[PDB]
């Protein structure tokens, strides 16, 4: 799904499993909390976030990890802004760009990202 | 604003007008189609795309611009993959990352991006 922005063509659920399995290894070592933070941040780069209500830190986290985190929904180690959006097939418009692609047309509750050229003849309407 | 992914805090319609004002300067000069393509590509990396149906090429484009374009809805000069999406408040889920921020919660028709910590208190629900 284009809405997940993952560098890896792998299901989100499975990506979190793999990431936490690497973390589990450091759960009991000395600077283990530092290690996990590193791996979690590396996961973020790949476009994979972990949430406490889905994969409780209590089941894999080193005791010091939670102190390094400034948030666990999802787990992040530096300030990250919080925004509100209402975007939907009903409000989408030209000018909008989603994960790198420009909004170009609509057809029902579907929105076309990228070039729309030659799509009008098929029921798509330009936004 | 977040759904427009523009490096400039300027209305979308104003950004395009500024871009096409520069393009017009080259509408009639020799090799102007090349100059306009550079300008339009600069707009792209800045977050602004132009569409033929919003601002027709016949009003500002140099005669050779169309030939260089691979599409005009919006104007691009190389392959751009076209995607079809179905997404909204009713479908948003964790694992989703929108223009850099992770989906974390839902309240009504609004969706929360970024940390949700402490929001469950305000009537928001983790996804
Ligand atoms: C950070 C990106 C990692 C990408 C590789 C993910 C590999 C996920 O591997 C997963 O491991 C689980 C057990 O840990 C198994 O139960 C799953 O079946 C398996 O697919
Ligand atoms: C790629 C980004 C370009 C930014 C330059 C924007 C220049 C604004 O352009 C001007 O804006 C005014 C109102 O805002 C209009 O009334 C003018 O007609 C228009 O030319
Ligand atoms: C950085 C990319 C710029 C691309 C635009 C190139 C425009 C070439 O501009 C050239 O200027 C010459 C005057 O010296 C004219 O004689 C040529 O006919 C004209 O094509
Ligand atoms: C001042 C001279 C400016 C030349 C304009 C260069 C615009 C670069 O346009 C290119 O567009 C591609 C997608 O279309 C991107 O993937 C490249 O990273 C980007 O460099």
Same domain flag for B51 and B107:
no
Task: Please indicate, yes or no, whether residues B71 and B99 belong to a single structural domain of this protein.
Answer: no
Model resolution, angstroms: 2.3
Q: Are A37 and A68 in contact (CB under 8 A)?
A: yes
Mark whether B99 and B74 lie in a shared domain. no
Q: What angle do CA A84, A91, B4 make, to 5 degrees?
A: 60
For residue B119, tell me if it sits in a domain. yes
Residue B71 dihedral angles phi and psi, to the nearest 5°: -170, 155
Question: A72 and chain B: CB distance < 8 Å anywhere?
Answer: yes
Query: Is the same domain home to B1 and B46?
Result: yes
Query: Looking at the structure, do residues B25 and B71 belong to the same domain, yes or no?
Result: yes
Q: What is the CATH number of the domain that holds B42?
A: 1.20.1280.150
- Per DSSP, chain B holds a count of helices (H) and strands (E) of 3, 7
Residue A120 belongs to domain spanning: 95-127
Do A15 and A61 belong to one domain?
yes
3-state secondary structure (DSSP) of residue A83: strand
Rg (CA), chain B: 19
Residues A2-23: b if buried by 16+ CB within 10 A, e if exposed: bbbbbeeeeebeebbeebbeeb
Query: Does residue A5 sit at the B interface (CB-CB below 8 Å)?
Result: yes
Question: Are residues A62 and A105 located together in one domain of the fold?
Answer: no
Q: Does residue B65 fall inside a structural domain?
A: yes
Q: Which residues of A are catalytic?
A: 53, 73, 94
How many structural domains comprise chain B? 2
Q: Has residue A126 been placed in a domain?
A: yes
Place of tokens 């787990």: A75
Which residues on chain B are in Cβ contact (under 8 Å) with A54? 94
Inspect the interface and report whether the beta carbons of B51 and A83 lie closer than 8 Å: no
> Beta strand B97-98 with B101-106: parallel, antiparallel or unpaired?
antiparallel
Asked, for residue B102, whether it belongs to a domain, the answer is yes
* A98 interface with B at CB cutoff 8 Å: yes
Shortest distance between the Cα of B103 and any Cα of chain A, in A, equals 9
From the number of C-beta atoms within 10 Å of its C-beta (0-12, 13-18, 19+), residue B34 rates as: middle
What are φ and ψ of residue A12, in 5° steps?
A: -50, -50
CA of B21 from ligand 2 middle (Å) equals 9
Indicate which CATH number applies to the domain containing A117: 2.30.30.710
């Amino acid at each position: 799904s284009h809405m997940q922005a993952s560098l890896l063509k792998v299901p989100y659920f499975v990506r979190v499993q793999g990431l936490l399995r690497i973390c589990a290894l450091a759960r009991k070592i000395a600077g283990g909390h530092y290690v996990q933070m590193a791996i979690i941040k590396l996961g973020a780069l790949t476009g994979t976030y972990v949430y406490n209500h889905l994969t409780p830190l209590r089941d894999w986290a080193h005791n010091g990890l939670r102190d390094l985190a400034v948030a666990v929904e999802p787990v992040v180690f530096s300030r990250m802004e919080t925004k509100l959006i209402t975007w939907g097939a009903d409000t989408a418009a030209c000018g909008d760009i989603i994960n790198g692609l420009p909004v170009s047309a609509r057809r029902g509750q579907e929105i076309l990202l990228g070039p729309a050229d030659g799509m009008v003849s098929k029921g798509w309407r330009l936004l």
